[PDB]
């Protein structure tokens, strides 16, 4: 088969230039096209026939293909460029795509804004309890959350979700939800989520006690 | 206007069955253009399925699908269809149509993508609980819990609030989906004025607003 090869990640600075590579054997003999895809959105054609640019596409986007490496170049990177990039060619009656390259913009370290939320009155009546911890707008990506019910850790019960890097301030968000039976909720008192993030040596704690809410 | 390719809605199908997604050239044509379909399993990348030139009655298919997949177009020749038979759990993916000029290779117009879920899991309606500080700047949330299948849509004050919002990718548990959204506003805003959470599950005819 024919094989296009894209690096999984390319991170660059705010303002500097991003270069994404599409390698394949004798690729300079093929007309190479590039697609940008942001989270949720459909792909958008950003470069075709190696160097040409479609309508609506910023001049900052340029391409080159010679030898065994086609290169997409994005100049003066903004957070509005955070997206997955696909490289595409034709080869023997078939369309071949590369695996995504995720372009991530670097930025200042930010601590997570942590916010805990009790179960709802409405949910409680249904018979269930879920506690939600929101860890918002932090950087770098990596974070750990610990859920503690009366100072004891709980590992199982939890469902976590992370946003794609934010298009506006290049930051990250996480939602962690500890969901129980209502009977369970009622057997203990303090519910705690501690966030372990690089910006601090001491984890961040948001808690509440049932007898006060 | 410049052509807008519009696909039919999210579908749910049980294994063994067929699915047929529509691709209409709102404000344009599919004639002497290449119509192409491409899919994407969640988390993974793009997978070409086939091309078709209605005006030549010739197709080309990815070996992988040839031929469970069948790309047809309408006379008018204004809508394109992809029919994929013999469905299986593997075929759960967003399905895109796109359109390239003849003999160019690229596709410069894409549809908006249609989700196809291939399961036997029964359509369950979501349940929407609000998130507030029960107990400087305020952070609030909706919790959309225990639904199936994807997707839902979540709005804040019907889009009049878009900034400060963080909607999270659903996750699946015990064969069910859960999703949260958080919105943070200035403390002079809640609860001085009201925040409402606008959720929507088309699969179960579920539309739910949620104050606070």
């Amino acid at each position: 088969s024919y094989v296009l090869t894209q690096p999984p990640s390319v991170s660059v600075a705010p303002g500097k230039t991003a270069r994404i590579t599409c390698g394949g054997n004798n690729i300079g003999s093929k007309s190479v096209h590039w697609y940008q895809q942001k989270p949720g959105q459909a792909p958008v054609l950003v470069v075709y026939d190696d160097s040409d640019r479609p309508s609506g596409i910023p001049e900052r986007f340029s391409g080159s293909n010679s030898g065994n490496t086609a290169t997409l170049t994005i100049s003066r990177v903004e957070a509005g460029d955070e997206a997955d990039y696909y490289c595409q060619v034709w080869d023997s009656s078939s369309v071949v795509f590369g695996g995504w390259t995720k372009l991530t913009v670097l930025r200042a370290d930010a601590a997570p804004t942590v916010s805990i939320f009790p179960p709802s009155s409405e949910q409680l009546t249904s018979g269930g309890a879920s506690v939600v911890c929101f860890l918002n707008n932090f950087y770098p990506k990596d974070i750990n959350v610990k859920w503690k019910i009366d100072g004891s850790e709980r590992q199982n019960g939890v469902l976590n979700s992370w946003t794609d890097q934010d298009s506006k301030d290049s930051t990250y968000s996480m939602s962690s939800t500890l969901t129980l039976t209502k009977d369970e909720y009622e057997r203990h008192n303090s519910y705690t989520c501690e966030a372990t993030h690089k910006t601090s040596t001491s984890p961040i704690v948001k808690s509440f006690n049932r007898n006060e809410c | 206007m410049q052509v807008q390719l519009v696909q039919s809605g999210a579908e749910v199908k049980k294994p063994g069955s067929s699915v047929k997604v529509s691709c209409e050239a709102s404000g344009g044509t599919l004639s002497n253009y290449v119509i192409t379909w491409v899919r994407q399993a969640p988390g993974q990348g793009l997978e070409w399925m086939g091309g078709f030139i209605p005006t030549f009655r010739t197709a080309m298919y990815a070996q992988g699908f040839q031929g469970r997949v069948t790309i047809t177009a309408d006379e008018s020749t204004s809508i394109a269809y992809m029919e994929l038979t013999n469905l299986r759990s593997e075929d759960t993916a967003v399905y895109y149509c796109a359109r390239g000029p003849l003999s160019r290779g690229y596709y410069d117009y894409w549809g908006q993508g249609t989700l196809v879920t291939v399961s036997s899991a029964k359509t369950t309606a979501p349940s929407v609980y609000p998130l507030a500080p029960v107990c400087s700047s305020v952070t609030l949330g909706c919790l959309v819990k225990g639904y199936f299948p994807e997707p839902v849509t979540l709005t804040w004050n019907s889009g009049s609030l878009s900034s400060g919002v963080h909607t999270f990718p659903a996750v699946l548990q015990s064969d069910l989906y859960t999703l949260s959204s958080s919105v943070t506003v200035t403390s002079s805003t809640w609860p001085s004025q009201s925040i409402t959470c606008n959720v929507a599950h088309p699969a179960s005819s579920t539309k739910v607003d949620k104050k606070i």
């Binding site: 034709w90 | 010739t58 080309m60």
Partner: peptide
């Protein structure tokens, strides 16, 4: 024979 989909530069 399918040069109706791509050209050879």
């Amino acid at each position: 024979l399918a040069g109706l989909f791509y050209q050879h530069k």
